[PDB]
Amino acid sequence: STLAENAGLNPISTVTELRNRHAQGEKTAGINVRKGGISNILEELVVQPLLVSVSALTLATETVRSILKIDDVVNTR
Amino acid sequence: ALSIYLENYATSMGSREQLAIAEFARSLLVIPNTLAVNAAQDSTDLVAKLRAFHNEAQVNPERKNLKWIGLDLSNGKPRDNKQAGVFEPTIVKVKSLKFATEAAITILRIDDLIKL
Amino acid sequence: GRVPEEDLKRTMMACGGSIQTSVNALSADVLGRCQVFEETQIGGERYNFFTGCPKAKTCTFILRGGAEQFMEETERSLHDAIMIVRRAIKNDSVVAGGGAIEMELSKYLRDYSRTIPGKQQLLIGAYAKALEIIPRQLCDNAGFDATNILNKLRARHAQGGTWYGVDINNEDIADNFEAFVWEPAMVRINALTAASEAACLIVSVDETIKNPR
Amino acid sequence: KDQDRKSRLMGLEALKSHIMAAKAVANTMRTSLGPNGLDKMMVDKDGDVTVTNDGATILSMMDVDHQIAKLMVELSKSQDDEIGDGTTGVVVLAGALLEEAEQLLDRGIHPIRIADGYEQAARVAIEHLDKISDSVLVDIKDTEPLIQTAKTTLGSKVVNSCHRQMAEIAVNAVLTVADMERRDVD
Amino acid sequence: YQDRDKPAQIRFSNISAAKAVADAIRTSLGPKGMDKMIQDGKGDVTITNDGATILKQMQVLHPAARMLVELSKAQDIEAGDGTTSVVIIAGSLLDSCTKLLQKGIHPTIISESFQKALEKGIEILTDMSRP
Amino acid sequence: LSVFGDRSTGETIRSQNVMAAASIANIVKSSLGPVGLDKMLVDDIGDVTITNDGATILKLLEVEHPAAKVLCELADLQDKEVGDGTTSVVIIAAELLKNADELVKQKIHPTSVISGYRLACKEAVRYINENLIVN
Amino acid sequence: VILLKEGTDSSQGIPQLVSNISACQVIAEAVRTTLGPRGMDKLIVDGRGKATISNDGATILKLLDVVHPAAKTLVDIAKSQDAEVGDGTTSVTLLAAEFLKQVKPYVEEGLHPQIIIRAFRTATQLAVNKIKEIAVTVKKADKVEQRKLLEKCAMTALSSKLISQQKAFFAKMVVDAVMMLDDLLQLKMIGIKKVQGGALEDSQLVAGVAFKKTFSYAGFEMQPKKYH
Amino acid sequence: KAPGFAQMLKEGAKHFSGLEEAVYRNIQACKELAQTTRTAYGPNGMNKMVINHLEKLFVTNDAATILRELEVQHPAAKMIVMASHMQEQEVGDGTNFVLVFAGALLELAEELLRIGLSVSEVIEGYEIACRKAHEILPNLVCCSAKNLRDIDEVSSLLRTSIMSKQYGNEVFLAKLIAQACVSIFPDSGHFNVDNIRVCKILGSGISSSSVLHGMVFKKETEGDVTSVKDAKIAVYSCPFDGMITETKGTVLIKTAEELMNFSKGEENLMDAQVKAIADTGANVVVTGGKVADMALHYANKYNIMLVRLNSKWDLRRLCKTVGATALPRLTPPVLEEMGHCDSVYLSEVGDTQVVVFKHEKEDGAISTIVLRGSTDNLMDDIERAVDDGVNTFKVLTRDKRLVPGGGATEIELAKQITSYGETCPGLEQYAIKKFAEAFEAIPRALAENSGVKANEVISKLYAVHQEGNKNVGLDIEAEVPAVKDMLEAGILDTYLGKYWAIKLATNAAVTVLRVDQIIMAKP
């Protein structure tokens, strides 16, 4: 929805349309900012490695779990 | 001249760009509108007279329709610059439109300010 | 008894009698007439009705549905449906609705304003852009994107379109003439005239005067 | 006339303000739902004092001067003649749909588009209920289970002390005025 | 309920400071990301859209917000890409946690639940990938 | 959020940069053309450099604003590349921002505006090149 | 002590026109969302607290009665359009405020109001001429009976509605009710009544007057229900 | 604490000191009066959204209606307003000439007083220039009415007066008023606006109007009689309703039969009352208020023509023509106070039946213009054009002398007066020259109201007059600031309209200049 907003598209209808294309299709459906709309990203040759998406969820969730476990902060001296 | 062409070109593209190209067309009229005010004349009329002679060139190529009509500041009337000899380099009008476009793009991308 | 006054007065104009309060003046002057009367069993309850009255310029349509909103929502749409059929028979000359005619005039006036040197150029063009509000609000009220439709709609009129307009059902442009979305041309003519005449009254005004009272 | 001090508010600030009023009527009744529902102490204009958890009685006494809340009461006035039981379920569900709609207005959805979405889902729900339904007195006129099921709901009210004698009475009444074959009771 | 002791105010304090860093860096995502204007204290001003450079030039003082800044550095060392996407994901999860905590769910139950989504999440991306 | 500075976001930041660039244009708007009016330049000491040339004004014009400094850096690009047309550049760029800022109020994203202005400049250079006269 | 006004409030020039332009847009905003069949409704409350819900532009303006001078001009113009036609008040109200909005920045730039009037009087006549030239007459197009084309126009308004699956039946009820009348047609003549329950196709069309007949007093097995 | 206010010793009135220029303040009150009507001058005059004292909305551009509704409290402005009221006497036009011209004389006088010229010397210059203007104005007379009583002639000259009150529709109104005016000019030496009446009727538009003879009344005949030639017309102000006895007349009723007996006794009395109307030789009756149902049939019984005039001004209109005066009692058979008429009949025009009082036996010198319009405010504004249009030709019954309009005379009269001041030595030349510049304010008003640079109009109007091209005025056009000949276009003004306007405007300006201090009083 942030990519769709930056590409001038509607943030809701873009992800709302893609959630149906993923239920019916595969992960090839994604936002193409070069053309300004939804397209088959597998054909556009716009890919990224797997470690970026995996390490993102891994490190982000650990930070959220760490922030969630903060009950309070103490000021020492 | 670009005020009429780009306004017609905007109707061909669409896709959330018809209004922007139309405003780009209307923005160029500030130059003849500003030159008319500095020449102590009614800018609304002279700007309208330029766009009429230039629009008639687009409707058909017949010779009865005047072409390449400029703006004479002294007499306060449009004049054909080919006869009057009011010429400028091509790179000026080309670079000035390119640099002015890149500047507005550089400022439109600014949606936040952080001070330190 | 227990007949509503609206139904009684509706039968008054249909039968041609008169609703007399006191029973002392009841006579042939107020008494109505009819051709065929019968008591039916619509939905189990009895419904009286006089058919073929002398002044039978009226009728009634009984609705049925699972709730009031089925009938109330149906009530609103049928009243305009009666006017649409009432309009097509009266005036045979029509134009495409849904803002299709408003975009065609915007093309004609805008292309005409360029050939008009003077201060009338910006104003006739300003008159043209003002016609965009009719197809615009139909898209905004219908929950559609006015940008994508108006840009796709204004582009179609340039290529040769004359009846294409806004489709409230499908979020796209459609030939409102082929879709039988019509309106009377003379009724639309009186709208532009009353609009400009109303704007001219406001533009021609420059000062307001108020007697202290 | 009387344009001074006229109410003027529109947009999302108005819809959220309308949704805020409906939620107050729902949250007030969300606790009185079911047999374990919390009662509501109603004080009459004449100084009387009453306590109950009936959804219909709560709305009749609830004199909310907000206009959006009055429509919620007018809705329940018709429900008592159609459903009878789940008068709180209607108001509680309406408040839930409006509360979830507030999350959609921030996403940029139009109210009429949300209205069309709920109408589509309401048809999916109504279609699903017939699939998971079951019959009781199909192809036979019987009086035994008709007394049993009606007796269960009555056990929550003050008739619990003699709930069984009331159910047999409600059967002979409808059976008398109306015929089970025609299936059109008045 | 009384809710005399209110340690949840520190959760909303850390979530708001964490969500603030994500809301700023959100618009700069992708090739068409809107640029941002940073002004140094001396007087110099610069323009950029790289999310990594913006976080360094933010001078973050809150502890919870600093964890997102150090988080973005971890993504750069490990992967070197997706620096801006990480901070945006963390800001939305914490914003989503604000709705769950109001419902009476404990942070430990939320923490353990997110790990199960992470475990199933890695399987989803790995299955649909292209070796 | 607590920081050692200040931040300000929203659509008003676009408007603040729009009104700034519009202000710099009005300083060199009336001085456009050969009949342009002169303008004073009160320095910090007290000297008053009177001139109508738009390029000479922008070199000496000192407005402590980032958006205005972008147009000052823009002036050097046009002066070195060609050496003329700097006044029309600042005026054209100011109207594009004042018009684009109105579109942003109509829920038109700047990315869609940036895309339109790029295509308009491309077609404008095409129409210009097709309607020249050689030396 | 000695002043000219002494309570006489008066303002003239450009600020008065701009004040009337903004006041006219308020009347537009009151009827902007009601344009079209699927337009949003408007809730109006009188002095007694009685509610009024309606999406008709003409009915909304009658209940407002705005006291602003410039706003009364549009309301009286729109009211006349309702009496003469009964439709198009919202289009007239929106176009008028939009003609005023588009010429608003030119009025501020020193353009005279009278030059603006010559444009509307000129552009209007050109528009009225373009309508008649492009308009089309449809009486017996494609050799189709008028009863069939009017059915298409009727279901058009009823399309994708709560009666969309059975609009073929409802479409005929409109054509039948209108054809029953004489040459003088009017919307008030053809009444409608509501009956809860039953299928949608069971909606009946009585040729005469009909009513619920709540009369349930004694009198059965007498009082013949048929009369010549 | 001293020093307090200087020159303030009379009821604490605001006495402006020598620095505050007390004379300059009374002038500012008159300049503001001009700006309220400077914009309404000419065919392109701007309308005024006037709010009546009854909280009624009216949009008009007539000067007399603006000032009548604008409560002018400043006395210095009342003098110029009194000149406008005096302008209405001897002529029915040129009102804004008094406001615009006098406002320019006072506005330009400040430029003289600021220099140091005495107010007594300024007055002598305006009085000299006014006397000089009256000598030049006959020389500017271009054409004169032929007095052929031709509708083609009367309508042609009348177009100038109709415009600036109801623009665009100057063709229909000029023909109708010409048809009404031509039918009375044969009555030599008796023409007056009181004969040519106006009757407004709600209708389609202005194009559906026409002229009819006699005192027309929009209210159709309530009775069933179509025509009656009876002279005796009985007018009663009291309506036909339940009678009341001026003495005690105590009426006691207890039972239901007694209610019916008294009800029958009233109907038998009313049958005798209407019987008395026919007994006095009068088959016509008028009523102000409601008309009863039984009395209506009694009017048809004796074939008495029933007439209804709800408007009070309509009743008084008949009292001064036929003589039938309204009595306080309900149907008193007073045959002495009845009227006299040659013919009374009903007539349908424009799909509306209207009562008519035609003079068939008598010669007849009365007419009425039946106007049609879909708005009451529109017909009232058109009625004001009829008065200013008919009164234009009431002046032409006098010496028929027309002068060019459109600001043409104002430049030539200014050009001729400016030359007289240049060659006239002394101090009077300063005020004489400014008297010429005051005339330039009128073309400047027409140019500003048409959206044209006024200075360009004065520059062109003086150039063509320098070459001797008189009769040249401002070409009314939005996109053409040039000029044209007023003679060829047919735009012409009246001589007496400019004569009495320049005279009364100068006296109003001089009367204000002669005043230097406004002082309160008490009886």
Q: Which two tokens stand for residue H137?
A: 């104005």
Closest residue in chain B to residue E40, using alpha carbons only: B116
Candidates C63, H293, H421, F66; CA nearest to G206 is: C63
Helices (H), chain C: 5-11, 68-90, 100-114, 120-130, 133-141, 146-159, 185-203
Gap between the Cα atoms of H151 and E9, Å rounded: 94
Cα R_g (chain B), whole angstroms: 17
Q: How far apart are CA H270 and CA F128, in angstroms?
A: 96
Chain F residues whose CB is inside 8 A of the B12 CB are none
Kindly state the tokens that stand for C157.
């009129």
For residue A35, what are its two tokens?
A: 């053309």
Q: Which residue has the tokens 């475990």?
A: E119
Alpha-carbon distances of C165 from B7, B16, C101, C102, C180, rounded to whole Å: 21, 18, 8, 9, 12
CA distances (Å), H404 to each of G126, H98, H480, in order?
35, 18, 20
Contact H486, H473 (CB under 8 A): yes
DSSP C17-70: ----SSGGG-STTT----SEEEEE-GGGS-EEEEES-TT---EEEEEEESSHHH
Sole residue written with tokens 């990315």: F111
**Contact flag C158-B51 (C-beta cutoff 8 Å):** no
Order of all β-strands in the sheet with H57-60: G11-12, C205-210, H47-51, H57-60
Euclidean distance between CA atoms F72 and F3, whole angstroms? 31
CA distance E105 to E98: 10
Q: D112 vs C142: CB contact, 8 Å cut-off?
A: yes
Nearest CA-CA partner of F80 in B95, G196, C119: B95
Please give the Cα distance from G13 to H449 (Å, whole number): 12
For residue H481, the distance in angstroms to the closest alpha carbon of chain G comes to 12
CA distance C1 to H149: 73
Amino acid (1-letter code) at residue C135: P
Q: Which residues of C touch B17 (CB under 8 A)?
A: 151
Interface of A with D in 8-47 (CB under 8 A): 10-12
d(CA H317, CA C88): 51
On whether H373 is known to bind a ligand per the annotation, the reply is no
**Rounded distance, CA E33 to CA D143, Å?**
72
Maximum C-alpha span of chain F: 64
Task: Output the CA–CA distances (angstroms, integers) from residue A27 to A13, A18, A32, A35, A39, in the order listed.
Answer: 17, 9, 13, 18, 11
User: Does E24 reach chain A within 8 Å, measured CB to CB?
Assistant: no
Query: Measured between alpha carbons, how far is H429 from H425 in angstroms, rounded to an integer?
Result: 7
Helices within A7-49 (DSSP H only):
11-24, 41-44
Pick the CATH number of H212-397 from 3.50.7.10, 2.40.100.10, 1.10.3720.10, 3.40.50.300: 3.50.7.10
Chain E positions in Cβ-Cβ contact with residue B116 (cut-off 8 Å): 38-41, 57, 59
Q: Do E122 and A57 make contact, defined as CB atoms within 8 angstroms?
A: yes
CA distance A2 to E22: 12
Quick one: tokens of C17?
């009698």
Q: What is the DSSP secondary-structure string of D28-92?
A: HHHTT-STTPPPEEEE-TTS-EEEE--HHHHHHH----SHHHHHHHHHHHHHHHHTSS-HHHHHH
Assign H113 to helix, strand or coil: helix
Query: Are B48 and C117 inside 8 Å of each other by CB?
Result: yes
Name the residue among E68, E70, E86, E63 with its Cα closest to residue E13: E63
Q: How far is CA E107 from CA A66, D40, E15, E89, G32, in A?
A: 10, 35, 12, 18, 48
CA distances from H145 to C87, F37, G223, H209, H393 (A): 55, 57, 86, 27, 10
Give the Cα-Cα-Cα angle C192, G68, C189 (nearest 5 degrees).
5
Q: What letter would DSSP give residue F42?
A: B
D156 annotated ligand-binding residue: yes
What kind of experiment solved this structure? cryo-EM
Alpha helices in H188-343 (DSSP H): 256-279, 293-301, 312-319
G137-170 CB burial, b ≥16 within 10 A, e <16? ebeeeeeeebeebbbebbbbbbbebbbeeebeeb
What amino acid occupies position H463?
A: A
Q: What are phi and psi of F40, to 5 degrees?
A: -80, 155
Backbone dihedral angles phi then psi of residue B45, each to the nearest 5 degrees: -80, -45
Distance (Å) from the alpha carbon of A5 to chain F's nearest alpha carbon: 8
Measured distance CA(D129)–CA(D137) in Å, rounded: 18
Task: Note whether E touches H: 3 CB pairs or more under 8 A.
Answer: no
User: Considering only CA atoms, which of H523, H517, H516, H513 is closest in space to residue H108?
Assistant: H513
CB H138: neighbour CB atoms within 10 A? 12
Q: Which residues of G touch H35 (CB under 8 A)?
A: 12
Whether chains D and A touch (3+ CB pairs under 8 A) is answered by yes
Q: Which residues of C touch G74 (CB under 8 A)?
A: 198
DSSP-derived secondary structure for H341-401: -SEEEEEE-SS-EEEEEE-SSS----EEEEEEES-HHHHHHHHHHHHHHHHHHHHHTSS--
User: Does residue C141 belong to the interface with chain D, where contact is any CB pair within 8 Å?
Assistant: yes
CA-only gyration radius of chain D, Å:
21
CB A66 within 8 A of CB E67: yes
CB of H47 less than 8 A from some CB of C: yes
- G104 CB contacts (<8 Å, ≥6 apart)? G18, G21
A70 in helix, strand or coil?
A: coil
Nearest CA-CA partner of G195 in G204, G187, G186, G184: G204
Q: Is C44 exposed, middle or buried (0-12, 13-18, 19+ CB in 10 A)?
A: exposed
Q: Which residues of C touch H (CB under 8 A)?
A: 118-120, 201, 204-213
Cβ-contact G166, G201 below 8 angstroms: yes
d(CA G40, CA G30): 11
Q: Taking the CB of residue E119, how many other CB atoms lie within 10 A of it? A: 10
Residues 6+ apart with CB under 8 A from H225: H283, H299, H300, H303, H304, H305, H306
- Physical contact, F and A (3 or more Cβ pairs within 8 A): yes
F96 membership: H or E segment, kind and range: helix F86-105
Q: Which residues of G touch H14 (CB under 8 A)?
A: 1-2
User: Is the Cβ of E124 closer than 8 Å to some Cβ of chain A?
Assistant: no
CB B5 within 8 A of CB F127: yes
Give residue for tokens 């002294």. B74
Strands (E), H52-105: 57-60
Q: Is A54 on the interface with E (CB under 8 A)?
A: yes
Tokens of A76: 């020492």
Closest residue on chain C to D112 (Cα): C143
Report chain C residues whose CB lies below 8 A from the CB of G83: none
Dihedral-angle region of residue C33 (phi above 0 means left; psi in -120 to 50 means alpha; beta otherwise): beta
Nearest CA to E36 out of F65, B107, A36, F107 is that of: B107
Q: Which tokens belong to E34?
A: 């809107």
Q: How far is CA G163 from CA G199, H254, H407, in A?
A: 11, 64, 70
Cβ atoms E40, B116 nearer than 8 A: yes
The single-letter code of the amino acid at G108 is E
Q: Do F3 and E60 touch (CB under 8 A)?
A: yes
Residue D166, token pair as written in the block: 């009331």
Binding partners of C (≥3 Cβ pairs within 8 A): B, D, G, H
Contacts of G196 (CB under 8 A, 6+ apart): C65, C67, C68, C71
Q: Specify whether the CB–CB gap between G58 and G89 falls below 8 A.
A: yes
Tell me the backbone φ, ψ of residue C98, rounded to 5 degrees. 65, 25
The tokens describing H66, both together, are 């603006």
DSSP string, D149-162: HHHHHHTTSGGGGG
Both tokens of G145, joined, read: 């009976």
CA distances from H157 to C203, D58, H343 (A): 31, 82, 34
Cα–Cα distance, H341 to H363 (Å, whole number): 12
Token digits of residue H302: 């004796």
Task: Report the length, in residues, of chain F.
Answer: 135
- Across the interface, do B110 and E58 touch by the CB < 8 Å criterion? no
- Token reading at F98: 């004042």
Using omega within 30 degrees of 0 as the cis cutoff, is the peptide bond preceding G105 cis? no
Chains G and F touch (3+ CB pairs under 8 A): no
* Chain G, chain H: beta-carbon pairs less than 8 Å apart: 49
Helix (H, G, I), strand (E, B) or coil at F108: coil
**Residue B11 Ramachandran class (φ > 0 left, ψ -120 to 50 alpha, else beta):** alpha
Distance between G47 CA and the closest CA of chain C, angstroms: 25
Q: Which of residues 81-110 of B touch C (CB under 8 A)?
A: none
Helices (H), chain G: 14-30, 57-64, 69-84, 89-102, 104-108, 113-134, 146-157, 167-179
How far away is chain G from the Cα of C167, in angstroms, using its nearest Cα? 11
Under 8 Å between Cβ of D17 and D9:
yes
Give the separation between CA F113 and CA B106, rounded to whole angstroms: 12
Nearest to C143 among D78, D112, D184 (CB): D112
Chain F residues with CB under 8 Å of A5 CB are 109
Report CB contact under 8 Å: C14, G206: no
**Which chain G residues are within 8 Å of H374, Cβ to Cβ?**
80
Coil vs helix vs strand at E52: helix
Residues 6+ apart with CB under 8 A from D129: none
Nearest residue on chain H to G13, alpha-carbon basis: H39
H484 is in an annotated binding site: no
Query: Would you mind telling me the total number of residues written for chain D in this entry?
Result: 186
- Considering only residues 131 to 160 of chain C, which have any Cβ-Cβ distance to chain B shorter than 8 Å? 147-148, 151-152, 154-155, 158
Resolution in angstroms comes to 3.1
Residues of chain E with Cβ-Cβ distance to B111 below 8 Å are 27, 34-36
Could you tell me what percentage of chain F is helix, strand and coil, using 3-state DSSP and rounding each to the nearest 5?
60, 5, 35
**Measuring CA to CA, how many Å separate F78 from each of B106, F73, F94?**
16, 9, 16
DSSP state, residue H206: G
Cα H154 to Cα G123: distance, rounded to the nearest angstrom: 35
Report the distance separating Cα H57 and Cα H385, nearest Å. Answer: 19
For residue F106, give the amino acid letter. Q
Pairwise CA distance, residues H406 & H490, whole Å: 11
CB distance from E126 to chain B under 8 Å?
no
H449 CB near a chain G CB, below 8 Å? yes
Indicate yes or no: CB of G206 within 8 angstroms of CB of C3. Answer: no
Picking from B14, B31, B32, the residue whose alpha carbon sits closest to that of residue B22 is B14
Q: Which amino acid is at G203?
A: S
Q: Is F26 on the interface with A (CB under 8 A)?
A: no
Written as six digits, the tokens of F54 are: 């738009």
Q: Are β-strands E36-39 and E45-48 bridged in parallel, bridged antiparallel, or unpaired?
A: antiparallel
At A30 the three-state DSSP class reads: strand
Residue H339: which H helix or E strand, with range? none
Tokens 């008739």, located at residue: D159
Chain E hits for B112, CB-CB cut-off 8 Å, are 24, 27, 36-37
E8 touches chain A (CB under 8 A): no
Min CA distance, F132 vs chain E (Å)? 35
Q: Which residues are within 8 A (CB) of H520 and not within 5 positions of it... i.e. 6 or more apart? A: H10, H11, H13
Structure tokens at C83: 């006017």
